[PDB]
């Protein structure tokens, strides 16, 4: 039949004026792997608008949750700003994406590097019980500009205290819980992330996932290549998986 279903907005939560999470109804048939993204849409007049969002809720949850940043003059953002419980939202029947951590072998140290809304797929991955079982440590570094944008900080700091480590990074504001004033590629170069994790990072033992703004993803990838890491490919184990967050 159609390539999508009509779902309902269940609720919208403002964490700041411009950062929302929201939940939608989940059809019985909708399957995804943690780390993948949905395509969400609205009827607009006689046409459509569609955008991709990483699922932030657990694979086993009974709803689908998403984390969206509201962009000035952005067309989907204007619709998100007006939507409310009971409104129709369209859900593409297929989930997509290759941020699939179980393609890395058990026993490694998993290091997730993200910016902004790029934390979203890693939230779903952290809800998989087997991820902290399979990997020796699970580490999440979330870079934003200002500490107000660390909207999962209280939750992830509490989970932090097979260890889970959370390192917040604020690139434009000085936060005397994490690291401040520098972006993730620089913090890899100067060993600050390794020091914050209290875990030596090596190509043999570390496996990276990257999700963030395109410039950060590129700069982080190139930095890791300089440090001796390689992309995961079909036949290459490698140490890096990456996806642009927009
Ligand atoms: C695979 C994939 C996964 C995505 N996952 C998410 C997600 O989990 N959460 C989310 O909020 N967005 C996500 N995005 C972006 C999302 O699809 C939209 O682009 C976003 O909601 C803005 O839509 P818009 O129509 O208001 O603006 P658009 O017309 O789509 O974009 C306008 C401009 O806003 C900027 N922009 C867009 N999205 C972002 C963002 N998230 N952070 C910073 N700047 C941005 C870009 O400069 C873009 O050119 C994803 C995109 C892709 C391709
Ligand atoms: Cl609502
Ligand atoms: Cl599923
Ligand atoms: Cl959930
Ligand atoms: Cl903006
Ligand atoms: Cl509606
Ligand atoms: Cl797979
Ligand atoms: Cl970002
Ligand atoms: Cl956060
Ligand atoms: Cl500034
Ligand atoms: Cl700038
Ligand atoms: Cl400051
Ligand atoms: Cl960064
Ligand atoms: Cl090594
Ligand atoms: Cl960018
Ligand atoms: Cl390459
Ligand atoms: Cl290959
Ligand atoms: Mg499964």
Sequence-distant (6+) residues with CB within 8 A of 80 are 12, 20, 22, 68, 70
Backbone phi, psi, residue 243, to 5° = -150, 130
Together in a domain, 227 and 205: yes
Report residue 47 as tokens.
């046409």
Together in a domain, 40 and 159: no
Task: Tell how far CA 83 is from the center of its chain.
Answer: 23
Q: Measured between alpha carbons, how far is 183 from 43 in angstroms, rounded to an integer?
A: 39
State the residue range of the domain holding 68.
1-96
Query: Which strands sit side by side in the sheet containing 63-69, from one edge to the other?
Result: 47-54, 37-44, 88-92, 4-16, 19-25, 63-69
Task: Please tell me what resolution, in angstroms, this structure has.
Answer: 1.6
3-state secondary structure (DSSP) of residue 38: strand
Yes or no: say if 179 and 187 are a contact pair by the CB < 8 Å rule: yes
Residue with tokens 């950062």: 19
**Ligand positioned closest to the Cα atom of 184:** 13
Yes or no: say if 185 and 192 are a contact pair by the CB < 8 Å rule: no
**Residue whose C-alpha is closest to residue 59's, from 91, 39, 30:** 30
176 CA distance to ligand 14 middle (Å) = 33
Q: Are strands 206-212 and 109-115 parallel, antiparallel or unpaired?
A: parallel
**Residue whose C-alpha is closest to residue 100's, from 52, 32, 33, 31:** 33
Yes or no: say if 146 and 174 are a contact pair by the CB < 8 Å rule: no
Is 68 touching ligand 1 by the criterion CB < 6 Å? yes
Residue with tokens 């086993």: 60
Rg (CA), the chain: 18
66 CA closest ligand 1 atom index: 8
The residue from 41, 71, 96 where one domain ends is 96
Q: Measured between alpha carbons, how far is 221 from 241 in angstroms, rounded to an integer?
A: 9
Counting the structural domains of the chain, the total is 2
What kind of experiment solved this structure?
X-ray
Cα separation values, 193 from 39, 93, 94, 100, 124, Å? 33, 38, 36, 22, 22
Q: Measured between alpha carbons, how far is 216 from 69 in angstroms, rounded to an integer?
A: 17
The residue from 96, 111, 140 where one domain ends is 96
Backbone phi, psi, residue 140, to 5° = -130, 125
Cα-based angle 124, 126, 131 (whole degrees, multiple of 5): 120
**Ligand positioned closest to the Cα atom of 61:** 4
The residue from 40, 65, 96 where one domain ends is 96
């Amino acid at each position: 039949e159609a390539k999508f279903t009509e779902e309902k907005i269940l609720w919208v939560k403002h964490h700041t004026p411009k950062l929302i999470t929201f939940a939608i109804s989940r059809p019985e048939s909708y399957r995804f792997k943690a780390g993948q993204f949905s395509r969400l849409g609205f009827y607009e007049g006689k046409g459509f608008i569609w955008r991709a969002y990483s699922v932030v809720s657990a694979e086993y949850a009974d709803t689908l949750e998403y984390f969206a940043v509201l962009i000035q003059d952005g067309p989907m953002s204007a619709l998100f700003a007006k939507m409310q419980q009971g409104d129709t939202i369209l859900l593409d029947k297929n989930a997509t994406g290759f941020l699939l951590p179980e393609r890395f072998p058990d026993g490694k140290d998993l290091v997730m590097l993200c910016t902004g809304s790029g934390i979203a797929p890693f939230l779903s991955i952290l809800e998989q019980p087997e991820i902290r079982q399979r990997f020796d440590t699970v580490n999440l570094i979330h870079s934003v500009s200002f500490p107000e944008e660390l909207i999962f900080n209280d939750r992830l700091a509490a989970l932090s205290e097979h260890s889970f480590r959370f390192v917040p990074v604020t690139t434009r504001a000085a936060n005397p819980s994490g690291l401040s004033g520098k972006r993730i590629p620089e913090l890899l170069k100067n060993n600050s992330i390794e020091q914050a994790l209290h875990t030596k990072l090596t190509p043999e033992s570390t496996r990276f996932m990257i999700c963030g703004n395109p410039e950060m993803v590129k700069d982080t990838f190139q930095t890791l290549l300089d440090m001796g890491y390689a992309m995961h490919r079909n036949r290459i184990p490698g140490q890096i998986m990456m996806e642009n967050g927009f």
